[PDB]
Design a protein around this ligand. Structure first.
Ligand code: NA
Ligand code: NA
Length: 220
């Protein structure tokens, strides 16, 4: 499916370029109408990235998140700075449907495996860049969290070939693709790779296309 996304810093909708990251451009301070229109066009899942809470969890934009969550009627994914069990609970209590676990927390697998046992697997999403650079490869990650029902994995950046393999290898894992979306053809490329969800951010803010077009292309 198509999962529209927004990166937020201090309530400001911004744009970044992720590496092993810096802000590029501001787009405004009214995220809700953008999210509300996204859902109106038929989007079924919305994605949010708390970049503020990412660099410091004490400055987690909880109030904005509960505002945006209650503002739409579709499940909402939030990531960035989720490094402890209380952070997952705090977000769930804010209305968040799925929480994206930071790669930092993966250094303590026994701690993270405890979160899966409590909150369940449908509420957690593990993020990967495919591995984490103490290197955690995709297979090593799967073996670690398959006994606790791993289901959702977020892969971030001509990689259509790789997505064909990983999705065929792990049919029990719903893979989410992030990055590499700047044109309507990029969505058509992942259409038959087995990816269950495509994250689209800057292409919408730039006006390359709309969510309605993205969905029609994806569902074609
Ligand atoms: Na869709
Ligand atoms: Na809501």
């Amino acid at each position: 499916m198509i999962i529209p996304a927004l990166d937020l810093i201090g309530g400001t909708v911004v744009r970044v370029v992720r590496l092993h990251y810096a802000r590029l451009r501001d787009y405004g301070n009214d995220p809700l109408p953008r999210l509300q229109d996204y859902a109106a066009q038929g989007a079924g899942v919305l994605h949010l990235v708390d970049l503020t809470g990412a660099k410091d969890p004490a400055k987690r934009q909880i109030p904005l998140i509960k505002t945006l969550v209650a503002g739409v009627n579709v499940p909402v994914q939030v990531g960035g700075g989720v490094r402890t069990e209380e952070d997952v609970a705090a977000l769930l209590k804010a209305g968040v449907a799925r929480v994206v676990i930071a790669s930092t927390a993966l250094k303590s697998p026994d701690v993270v495996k405890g979160w899966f046992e409590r909150f369940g697997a449908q509420a957690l999403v593990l993020a990967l860049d495919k591995q984490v650079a103490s290197g955690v490869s995709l297979e090593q990650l799967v073996e670690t969290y398959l006994p606790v029902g791993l289901k959702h994995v977020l892969c971030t950046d001509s990689n259509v070939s790789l997505y064909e393999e990983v999705c065929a290898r792990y049919p029990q894992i719903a893979f989410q693709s992030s990055g590499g979306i700047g044109d309507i053809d990029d969505i058509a490329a992942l259409r038959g790779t087995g990816v269950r969800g495509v994250i689209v951010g800057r292409a919408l803010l730039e006006g390359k296309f709309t969510v309605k077009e993205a969905i029609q292309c994806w569902q074609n």
